């Protein structure tokens, strides 16, 4: 019948046995973004709808707008209490609100937005969609995963054993198009990162970070060529005990090399595309502990690989 046809056209339609490593990194990486939320909110996710969210981060605009003013904190107090109502947390309300709580607020209300977007075509697939983003893995058997693995371990300056347990390819489609290769000098970086951002990166990408009106080449994209400078920053999670490593082609032309800091930097110096903070050596003191690497561009960046390791402590 038309049903029949219908039923064996959607059964071929909604099919796609996408591997196990996948399907396991999408499990986690949500998993873990879920437990950074009940870490912190009296309320499910599931019963927060897009509304509250929507209500929520209009509030903080206008906190914000008050703040910067010089509003009674009467009024702050009186405002925040609303978004409190709409967004329950455990544990201190802030009686003091700087600026630097409502830019997290803000990020978090972005981690609602995803938990509840998502929430919806099996629970694996409906995630993995929801990335926007095309993962792949890529087997040990092949000799890419040994061009990776090298890649990987080369600049090692710590000497600490590095358990390389998963690689994936990774691309999302408008970041490939928009990437400025054109302009020159593009080499292969490393991106550390806690487990709990990674559906925020793969979602939206590396974004620059909100200048409040903390990083020492000020906001921008920061990479590096070294393993043991990259572990650093890609904290284990608390849901395997994992740490997950970004792979990206840095489109950086004219990268000026630094050895004092700058934190007020908003974009590259006038005349160059990037920053080189140049690493302590025998006989060039710098400020810079580790080589950074930092761009001010999100199209100056392009994802290219995930890395699933894990250190022995
Ligand atoms: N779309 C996104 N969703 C969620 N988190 C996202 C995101 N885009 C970026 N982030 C995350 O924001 C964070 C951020 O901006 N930060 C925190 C880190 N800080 C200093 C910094 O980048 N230092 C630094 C220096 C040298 C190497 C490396 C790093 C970090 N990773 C490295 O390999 C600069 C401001 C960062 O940890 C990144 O992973």
Known sequence: SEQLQALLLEEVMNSSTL??????????????????????????????????????????????????????????????TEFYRLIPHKGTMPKEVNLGLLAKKADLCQLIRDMVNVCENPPSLAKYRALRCKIEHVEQNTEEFLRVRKEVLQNHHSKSPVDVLQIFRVGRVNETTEFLSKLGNV???????????????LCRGLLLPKVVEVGNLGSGIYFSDSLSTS?????????????????????????????????????????????????????????????????????????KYIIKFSMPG
């Not at 904290?235 to 994992?242: I, W």
């Not at 997950?244 to 934190?263: P, R, S, Y």
């Open 19 to 80: 591997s196990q490593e996948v399907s396991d990194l999408v499990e986690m990486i949500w998993a873990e973004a879920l437990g950074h939320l009940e870490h912190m909110l009296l309320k499910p996710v599931n019963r927060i709808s897009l509304n509250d969210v929507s209500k929520a981060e209009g509030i903080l605009l206008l906190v914000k707008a008050a703040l910067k003013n010089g509003e009674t904190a009467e009024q702050l107090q009186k405002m925040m």
């Open 187 to 201: 080499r292969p970086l490393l991106h550390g990162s806690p487990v709990q951002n990674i559906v925020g990166i």
């Open 231 to 303: 572990i650093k920053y890609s904290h284990p999670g608390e849901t395997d005990g994992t740490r997950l490593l970004l792979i990206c082609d840095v489109a950086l032309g004219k990268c000026m090399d630094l050895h004092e800091k700058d934190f007020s930097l908003t974009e590259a110096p006038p005349g160059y595309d990037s920053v080189h903070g140049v690493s302590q050596t025998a006989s060039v003191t710098t400020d810079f502990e580790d080589d950074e690497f930092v761009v001010y561009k999100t199209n100056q960046v392009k994802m």
